[PDB]
């Protein structure tokens, strides 16, 4: 049966796109692209869309578990936060696309062991002043889960142990770091 069945993923995922249009509210600029729940359907989608480095400034991609919208207000994000990766203008070229794909694989591959259930999704923001990639988790007070996801993520990204990344709550963002690894 390994011959003809697609490989189902642990979760079904939704990809979202955001395009900055000052005519519209922020929520109105957020749009679901499509969903998938197999490895094959993931790659069909990835191979079909623009690399993040080719997006116009002001655009975002978001990959979230089906039923979680990529906004702070979702029940699964209101008490959560994000591990934040900040990219200077030069890293748009060097690391943006490879960091984002690694992040996508950390999500769909459930790479954070027992704490993968705390993952909600990830977001890449393409911006003229500097890009951002982040993994969103559901509960910023679960120190074990947050710091563990943060350590795994930093290692999968290949970041030097010289560098530090930080985790901030969405509540703080909507109005500093809570954890660092």
């Amino acid at each position: 049966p390994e011959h003809y069945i697609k490989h189902p993923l642990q979760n079904r995922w939704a990809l979202w796109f955001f395009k900055n249009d000052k005519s519209k509210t922020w929520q109105a600029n957020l749009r679901l692209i499509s969903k998938f729940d197999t490895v094959e359907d993931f790659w069909a989608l990835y191979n079909h869309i623009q690399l993040s480095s080719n997006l116009m400034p002001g655009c975002d991609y978001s990959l979230f578990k089906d039923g979680i919208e990529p906004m702070w207000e979702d029940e699964k994000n209101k008490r959560g936060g994000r591990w934040l990766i900040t990219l200077n203008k030069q890293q748009r070229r060097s690391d943006l696309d490879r960091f984002w794909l690694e992040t996508l694989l950390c999500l769909i591959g459930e790479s954070f062991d027992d704490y993968s259930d705390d993952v909600c999704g990830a977001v890449v923001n393409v911006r003229a002043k500097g890009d951002k990639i982040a993994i969103w988790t559901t509960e910023c007070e679960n120190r074990d889960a947050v710091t563990h996801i943060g350590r795994v993520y930093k290692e999968r990204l290949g970041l030097p142990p010289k560098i530090v990344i930080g985790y901030q709550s969405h509540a703080d963002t909507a109005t500093k770091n809570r954890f660092v690894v």
Side-chain angles (χ1 to χ4, degrees), residues 1 4-26 28-75 77-128 130-142 144-154 156-161 165-175 177-178 180-181:
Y4 61 97
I5 289 88
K6 310 194 215 139
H7 299 76
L9 300 169
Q10 179 165 312
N11 289 285
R12 165 186 292 128
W13 297 91
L15 187 68
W16 297 75
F17 184 72
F18 175 93
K19 191 176 185 322
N20 202 32
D21 181 349
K22 293 185 181 188
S23 293
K24 302 143 97 151
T25 65
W26 181 90
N29 280 320
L30 181 61
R31 174 226 175 146
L32 163 79
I33 292 183
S34 64
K35 319 185 194 187
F36 60 87
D37 51 33
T38 68
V39 174
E40 289 78 4
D41 289 319
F42 165 75
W43 288 108
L45 173 60
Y46 180 86
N47 287 324
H48 178 238
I49 61 186
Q50 301 283 355
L51 293 171
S52 300
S53 62
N54 206 44
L55 289 186
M56 283 178 44
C59 290
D60 313 331
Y61 284 123
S62 299
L63 188 79
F64 275 62
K65 285 172 176 177
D66 192 18
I68 309 183
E69 296 187 324
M71 61 184 70
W72 305 322
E73 298 83 337
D74 188 285
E75 293 291 310
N77 301 325
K78 61 209 302 194
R79 311 294 229 157
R82 70 195 173 153
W83 278 110
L84 180 59
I85 309 297
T86 56
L87 301 181
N88 60 46
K89 309 176 148 187
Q90 298 70 50
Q91 298 174 83
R92 159 90 45 92
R93 159 176 184 266
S94 59
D95 317 315
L96 176 64
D97 295 331
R98 63 192 195 84
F99 280 5
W100 178 241
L101 174 59
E102 199 66 36
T103 307
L104 293 177
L105 299 169
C106 287
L107 267 46
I108 66 176
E110 314 276 341
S111 307
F112 307 110
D113 305 275
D114 320 329
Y115 289 141
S116 258
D117 263 30
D118 270 47
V119 172
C120 300
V123 181
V124 51
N125 315 108
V126 178
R127 291 304 181 267
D131 305 315
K132 293 180 186 78
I133 295 163
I135 287 192
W136 292 25
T137 80
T138 194
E139 172 64 81
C140 58
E141 312 272 357
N142 190 346
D144 282 345
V146 169
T147 68
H148 182 264
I149 298 163
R151 300 187 186 153
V152 178
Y153 191 32
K154 175 180 188 182
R156 292 280 304 268
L157 292 180
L159 297 181
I165 57 170
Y167 176 106
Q168 318 111 30
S169 73
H170 302 309
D172 289 336
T173 310
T175 53
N177 292 336
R178 308 276 186 104
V180 288
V181 299

